[PDB]
Amino acid sequence: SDRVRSITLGNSTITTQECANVVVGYGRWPTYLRDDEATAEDQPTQPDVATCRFYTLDSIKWEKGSVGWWWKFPEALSDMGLFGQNMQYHYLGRAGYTIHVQCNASKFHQGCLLVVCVPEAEMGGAVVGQAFSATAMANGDKAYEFTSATQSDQTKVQTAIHNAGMGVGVGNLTIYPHQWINLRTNNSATIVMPYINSVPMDNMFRHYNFTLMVIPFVKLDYADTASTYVPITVTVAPMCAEYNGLRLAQA
Amino acid sequence: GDVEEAIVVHVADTMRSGPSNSASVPALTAVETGHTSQVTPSDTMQTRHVKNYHSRSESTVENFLGRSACVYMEEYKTTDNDVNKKFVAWPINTKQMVQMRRKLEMFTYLRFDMEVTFVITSRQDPGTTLAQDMPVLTHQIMYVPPGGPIPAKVDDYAWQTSTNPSIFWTEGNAPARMSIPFISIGNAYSNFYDGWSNFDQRGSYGYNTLNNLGHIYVRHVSGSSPHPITSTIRVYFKPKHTRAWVPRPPRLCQYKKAFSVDFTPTPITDTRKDINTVTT
Amino acid sequence: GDVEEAIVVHVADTMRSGPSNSASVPALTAVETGHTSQVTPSDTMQTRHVKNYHSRSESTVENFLGRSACVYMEEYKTTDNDVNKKFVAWPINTKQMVQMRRKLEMFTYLRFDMEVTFVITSRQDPGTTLAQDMPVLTHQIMYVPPGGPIPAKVDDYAWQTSTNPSIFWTEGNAPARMSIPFISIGNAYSNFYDGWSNFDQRGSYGYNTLNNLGHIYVRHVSGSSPHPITSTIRVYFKPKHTRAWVPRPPRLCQYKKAFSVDFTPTPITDTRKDINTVTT
Amino acid sequence: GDVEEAIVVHVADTMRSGPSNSASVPALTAVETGHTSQVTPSDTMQTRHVKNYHSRSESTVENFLGRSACVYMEEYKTTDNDVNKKFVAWPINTKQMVQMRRKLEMFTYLRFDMEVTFVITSRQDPGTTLAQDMPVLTHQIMYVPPGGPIPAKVDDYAWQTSTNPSIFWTEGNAPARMSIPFISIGNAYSNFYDGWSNFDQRGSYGYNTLNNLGHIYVRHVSGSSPHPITSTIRVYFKPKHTRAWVPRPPRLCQYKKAFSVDFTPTPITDTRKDINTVTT
Amino acid sequence: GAQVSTQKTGAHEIIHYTNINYYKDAASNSANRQDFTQDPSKFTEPVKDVMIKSLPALN
Amino acid sequence: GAQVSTQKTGAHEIIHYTNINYYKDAASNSANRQDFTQDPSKFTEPVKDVMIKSLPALN
Amino acid sequence: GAQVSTQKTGAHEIIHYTNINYYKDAASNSANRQDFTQDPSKFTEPVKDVMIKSLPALN
Amino acid sequence: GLPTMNTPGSTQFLTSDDFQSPCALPQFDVTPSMNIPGEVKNLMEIAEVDSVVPVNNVQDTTDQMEMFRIPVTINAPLQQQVFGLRLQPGLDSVFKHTLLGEILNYYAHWSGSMKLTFVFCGSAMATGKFLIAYSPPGANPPKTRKDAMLGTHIIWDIGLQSSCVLCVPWISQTHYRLVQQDEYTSAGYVTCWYQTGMIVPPGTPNSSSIMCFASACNDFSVRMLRDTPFISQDNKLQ
Amino acid sequence: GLPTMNTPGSTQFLTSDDFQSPCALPQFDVTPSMNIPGEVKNLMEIAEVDSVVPVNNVQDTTDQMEMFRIPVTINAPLQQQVFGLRLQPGLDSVFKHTLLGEILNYYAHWSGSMKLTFVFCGSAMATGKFLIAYSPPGANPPKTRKDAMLGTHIIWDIGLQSSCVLCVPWISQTHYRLVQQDEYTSAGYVTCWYQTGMIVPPGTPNSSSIMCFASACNDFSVRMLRDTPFISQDNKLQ
Amino acid sequence: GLPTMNTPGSTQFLTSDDFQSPCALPQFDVTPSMNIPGEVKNLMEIAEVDSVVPVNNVQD
Numbered sequence A: 001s002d003r004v005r006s007i008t009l010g011n012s013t014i015t016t017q018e019c020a021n022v023v024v025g026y027g028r029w030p031t032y033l034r035d036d037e038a039t040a041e042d043q044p045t046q047p048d049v050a051t052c053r054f055y056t057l058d059s060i061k062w063e064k065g066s067v068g069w070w071w072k073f074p075e076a077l078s079d080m081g082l083f084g085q086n087m088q089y090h091y092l093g094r095a096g097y098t099i100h101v102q103c104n105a106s107k108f109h110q111g112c113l114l115v116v117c118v119p120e121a122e123m124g125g126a127v128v129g130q131a132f133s134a135t136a137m138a139n140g141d142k143a144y145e146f147t148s149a150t151q152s153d154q155t156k157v158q159t160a161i162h163n164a165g166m167g168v169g170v171g172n173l174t175i176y177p178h179q180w181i182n183l184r185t186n187n188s189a190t191i192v193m194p195y196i197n198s199v200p201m202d203n204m205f206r207h208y209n210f211t212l213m214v215i216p217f218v219k220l221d222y223a224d225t226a227s228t229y230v231p232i233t234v235t236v237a238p239m240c241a242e243y244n245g246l247r248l249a250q251a
Numbered sequence B, C, D: 001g002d003v004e005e006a007i008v009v010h011v012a013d014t015m016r017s018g019p020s021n022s023a024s025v026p027a028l029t030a031v032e033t034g035h036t037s038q039v040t041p042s043d044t045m046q047t048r049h050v051k052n053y054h055s056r057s058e059s060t061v062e063n064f065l066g067r068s069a070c071v072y073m074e075e076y077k078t079t080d081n082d083v084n085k086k087f088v089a090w091p092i093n094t095k096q097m098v099q100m101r102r103k104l105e106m107f108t109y110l111r112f113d114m115e116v117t118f119v120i121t122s123r124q125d126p127g128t129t130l131a132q133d134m135p136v137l138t139h140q141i142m143y144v145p146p147g148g149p150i151p152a153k154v155d156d157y158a159w160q161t162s163t164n165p166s167i168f169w170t171e172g173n174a175p176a177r178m179s180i181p182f183i184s185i186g187n188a189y190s191n192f193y194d195g196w197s198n199f200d201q202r203g204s205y206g207y208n209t210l211n212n213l214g215h216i217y218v219r220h221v222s223g224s225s226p227h228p229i230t231s232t233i234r235v236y237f238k239p240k241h242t243r244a245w246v247p248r249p250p251r252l253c254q255y256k257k258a259f260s261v262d263f264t265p266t267p268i269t270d271t272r273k274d275i276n277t278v279t280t
Numbered sequence E, F, G: 001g002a003q004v005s006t007q008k009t010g011a012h013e014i015i016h017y018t019n020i021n022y023y024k025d026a027a028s029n030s031a032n033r034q035d036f037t038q039d040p041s042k043f044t045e046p047v048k049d050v051m052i053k054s055l056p057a058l059n
Numbered sequence H, I: 001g002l003p004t005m006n007t008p009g010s011t012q013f014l015t016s017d018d019f020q021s022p023c024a025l026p027q028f029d030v031t032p033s034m035n036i037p038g039e040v041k042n043l044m045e046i047a048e049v050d051s052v053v054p055v056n057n058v059q060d061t062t063d064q065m066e067m068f069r070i071p072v073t074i075n076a077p078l079q080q081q082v083f084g085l086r087l088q089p090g091l092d093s094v095f096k097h098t099l100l101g102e103i104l105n106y107y108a109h110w111s112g113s114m115k116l117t118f119v120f121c122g123s124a125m126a127t128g129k130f131l132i133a134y135s136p137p138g139a140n141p142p143k144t145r146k147d148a149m150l151g152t153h154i155i156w157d158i159g160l161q162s163s164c165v166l167c168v169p170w171i172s173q174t175h176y177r178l179v180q181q182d183e184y185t186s187a188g189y190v191t192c193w194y195q196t197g198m199i200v201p202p203g204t205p206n207s208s209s210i211m212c213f214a215s216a217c218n219d220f221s222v223r224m225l226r227d228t229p230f231i232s233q234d235n236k237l238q
Numbered sequence J: 001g002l003p004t005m006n007t008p009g010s011t012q013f014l015t016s017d018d019f020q021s022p023c024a025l026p027q028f029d030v031t032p033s034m035n036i037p038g039e040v041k042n043l044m045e046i047a048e049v050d051s052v053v054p055v056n057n058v059q060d
Ligand SMILES: CN1CCN(Cc2ccc(NCc3cccc(F)c3)cc2)CC1
Pocket: B092, B093, B094, B114, B116, B143, B179, B180, B189, B190, B191, B192, B207, B208, B210, B211, B213, B214, B215, B216
């Protein structure tokens, strides 16, 4: 059967029994930087099993009125294991990622989720003109919530779900790598994202490589039942990570 | 041999199909995999053999982006009391004109050469006394890479360009034209930049951070008529040898700022009477 | 070999003929068959041998239709109170000018490339005060395929063409010229269309239904003189690489509508005193 | 064979380096020898293998000095009471414009061909009566090698050049251009000359002594309007086929004389709060 | 690319010209007005059975 | 230097043009709009395991 | 006379141009900005005895 | 020198010309190229990707996200219509702002076949059958399933495979169709009807939803570039 | 004659063009060439020569020559900073007017590694050790030797060899950096600290000085010529 | 560049000239050709077809 998948990174393993296949970025597998494309002179450091492993983020509750959530990377993993330490102590970084999202429900539940990775997901402020600090879109591993109505507070991003905070049709996000979690036939989605950027490497604290979005396109529904909500969990694992430019820590 | 004969691709043809009855089910699939079905009409119904000669030549990115488009216009007078009103100073950017902005923002990263054309026109300002005789005018276009000196008046010393490229153009001739190579410090231009300037996540945010292309200055060489004359310049960009990566959905909301993504929420699309209405 | 030597046809000659007396009757035939007799003077009378060097080179369709002809003219002012009077908007069609219309309507279907030339002239409007000094003017010609945005005023945003082709021309130079390929959705242009638009035989009737070529817009780039100036544009079409099918008789009645075949009955030809009158 | 295929150099690559422990000490040297250390980052720290494709094409002297730069401008009127104000007379030299002067003074000796371009513009002087009609103007540029006759008025006989090269230019066309070979009596131009003119160490001192390039004269051919008209000429030099010797440090103090090195003492550089301050 | 061909001239009384194309679109080429082939049969003899001029048209 | 290549034209219905470069910078050359290679797999089939259209998508 | 040579372009990513001279004076030719030879030894290593970087500068 | 004569068109500026021009930064060294993932070489590649179609434009949608869901109920008449729409990918409001409509709006002519994919997002215990039919152009759109099934159609059975594909064939009198479609170049209609109905067991929701995806086949093509009308400005941006 | 059409750009004057022009002194015989010593063919050759860096810009330097000397004393705390500066060769006041800064100011982009050479000019009997460290870009410059030594550094021992070389490696996210550097293209900091301290015998001065030399490595390069801002005039020179 | 001189006739518009001009729709794909019946290549072919002559022009 092709409905069973197993992934082993470092000292951690993920097993799923009901799952679609795996989407691989734009058809490119993560890989190390070549000698003919590098620009930095000194030797890189390639912590391997120490950093290339699965990390569980906090879990969220999926209610009947949920609208969606987003996370920004690698700021989400900025304070996780040795990956965070390497981010803090180095000037440049480079790594792919594997994202596994999990949502399980009985055969009597219905709903559909869209899981998509958006590279360079620049967002606009709630009030056109004013600006926001680096806290209305990223504060660690916590998830940020979309809104059904138009945002009004000037200190946060425009959370209109139908625009996705980018001024584009929410239904056109299919262009990016993605998968659907349909409770009828699926329980998890797996995406492998290669390193995508205009330069060989970059500061991991200054630049958000890509954004992960989960959007309910068919709201959750059920009847009777003692279960009041469906938890959603996100697991991520850097791949082929390497760093450079040892300075003092402290980002 | 003094001549080298460098010296195409049509869409797929339709093959003939007959009645079928088997366990194969091409029509049935599962979109949950993120995979777009590759079925063809030949799998669902009987079809005749048809040879297609249509080609996708006009849909290539090179042709799609290979059209000159206006990116900026400004007016400057030959003579006036205000010094700042006798010349133009424009920080180069492609976010000023909506059509070209939207065309470019369909891709995340771009790498191309540029072809720049300048269109200049002049007109006499209204006034009581317009009777005068003035010879043909001449204009100077100056490009100042970042960090170079900037003129502060029409007759400043900086207009004596020794290293800065410049063009002198006389009215009545063909529009000025010139080419410029790929001049990005990075490996490709970035239309979007989700990040900050300072390392502590503070300061400027957005693509504004990566705009360091320089400035363009224009003036009348020595024309100073007894009565004011107004001139207008239009700048046209034309990408060449283009390459693009990571396509993204076209924008839906109207632009509101020249250096930001700010917008106002917009409906997904227009409405109709009901889900069954099909008439006009 | 850097050179390829691609590198004609005279009318039939007349053969000699002598006295004849036989049962063959070339002169007698029957037009009821719809067959045009192929007899030659050599069959009815004695003739000498003559070698003809005349050729029909100038009667080919390529040469017959290979002449530039005016198809439209319109006037637009540089400055005026009425906004609609400062620019032109023409739906492309070949039924406006009678000579070219009749030349084209001798065939039912045509397929050719097109060569378009624009002639622009300007003149100062009469008025009390004409003393002014104005630099050379510049004009913009914009082509909008069907369904594209249409400008509503001289200084509209739509004039920033990013995909629509355009030409900028300055007075005093050679007339603008440009080529356009065969751009019909069908396999050939149709001068006549005997049918309706709706499937229930209702709506528009005639060739108007198939006219979806677009529009052409023209304006002064930025010229706005203290006193009005009027400009006139003339459009000339010149078919190239022509092919024609199904010839039809030339029209006899004068044209009366630009998008219809309506006419008034006309006599077959002029009269004379009697069937025997042969003098002037 | 009618065609000859004349038909580059990247910076040094970085080689990989591992941990080391030996008696060799590349980092330690002695500047007292006047020798600049040739160490590379690979000698002091571990490095990866990197292939560099950067080239120093744009840093060659040919490209550095291969840009047209203004060297002089002057105004002359078509008609005026003062005879000396109706034409220009300039002793050729490159010390008039600061930017080109500093660019040239980075080397002691130079040897190159020259490309000269002239930009001429005209404007009507202000006055009560400006209503006039004047045909296009024409200008004459005359070059007089040293020792030749010099005109003393606009209509002097010397303007009938029989051996002196000259250019006649009409307004509205492209700027005049011309080339000149290496015309120094010595083996190379000298930007600096530490010596005197007389053999007893007296007289003129400096590079002024070696400036014997001639003069340039400009006038309106025959234009003499009822009302004054002012014209301005700009001269641009562009070295070609350049060679340089003995580089010297760039100047630090502002120029003050066109034929001398005189200057005012200037601080070495700007100051900061203290030797440890590193913030903005 | 050079393309040499004869030019129009008179009868029984060099005549070559050179042409080169500069644009990448065939529509930009000059008119091909050197073709003189023709066949009036389609309109003059549209009958099914071949008719001989000498023989009677009918019977 | 002469570079001869075919020009765009129609289907089943000479077509060559000459080009020469005059400047020493490749950026000065004309647009190379004669390339028509394309591959939509990167966006239409980004899955890891190959999927056969005839066979069921899952199991 | 035709003189064909490569034009400047990028790295690991035809490039030829033709040039002809029209005047009888070499000074009229275009700038020869295609030379990239260089040698900094004259200014960086003007010493008489060769110095090895690895060995001590003195003794 | 060499005699010459200027022809018409000289000194003109045509925005779609291909000519060589001088470079103002001679011998400029460009940055080395790098193979970033996800290179796109033709807009048809983008056009061939699926996108959600907002079919539920009921003129009273207080919540925007409702536009993407097609309602379905358990107890309905034996024959009933689920939805209906016109096949005008570049002009109809349904397809106007989709990933395919946006690409089409930059052109004037289009041709080729289209794919419509429907996915059932109900409970795993729910079942049903639907009839989806495409009716070529005609004087009247179908009003009942009896009329609808006469044209091209497919019977969709809901099971483990949750998606079905309706391939709309290219049936036209002309090789191309106008994006700004009219009566002459009409393209037909698409409708969906209940084939058997939806049946659910106890303890499940009484309603479900369906979503539609639109994309182009491998024989799709466009022509005659033009400027899109969806974006406009009134003053220079600042 | 030969038909032709003029394209845009005709009759323009571009200051960086390469075209042939007539010679006004035909058949002029130039003077024979002579091989003068010291021919320079590339500005990088000049840029690769050392030059003294005026590090001591203390805002109260009454004597200009003091700017070239870094003070040092015998008795100092165990860990103390000798000097600190930003690595902005084309913008920082320290490197602005050096032989390398002057060359850089004629360009817009630069890349490659740099060499900093320090020479001890004390007595022959004096001794000491110094720590010189380079800190790549970050949110905060180092404040103590403990923080400083985490980055690239070299321990300098003063002996018979009076000079030491710190090779600053090229560590950047982009292939090039702007001469007019900003926060985006920052380059880091350089600092020096006492490693052991300076010890002197009786009968020697209690203070010494150090000098710094700056030069470019063999992988240095520049790009995008521009006009320098250090020189300006208000009226025509006479 | 290459020296040249313009001859009489430059910048004129002759309605019966044969010159190449730029195309404003580069790389445009034309519809495939189809052999419609009744192709005419020369007006003499039309001229060689019979037609009824109105000889009886009797003014009444
Ligand atoms: C933040 N980036 C800036 C570059 N932008 C694309 C772009 C647009 C125009 C240009 N023009 C470069 C140019 C070309 C010719 C002359 C000049 F002065 C400047 C370069 C890049 C994408 C967003």
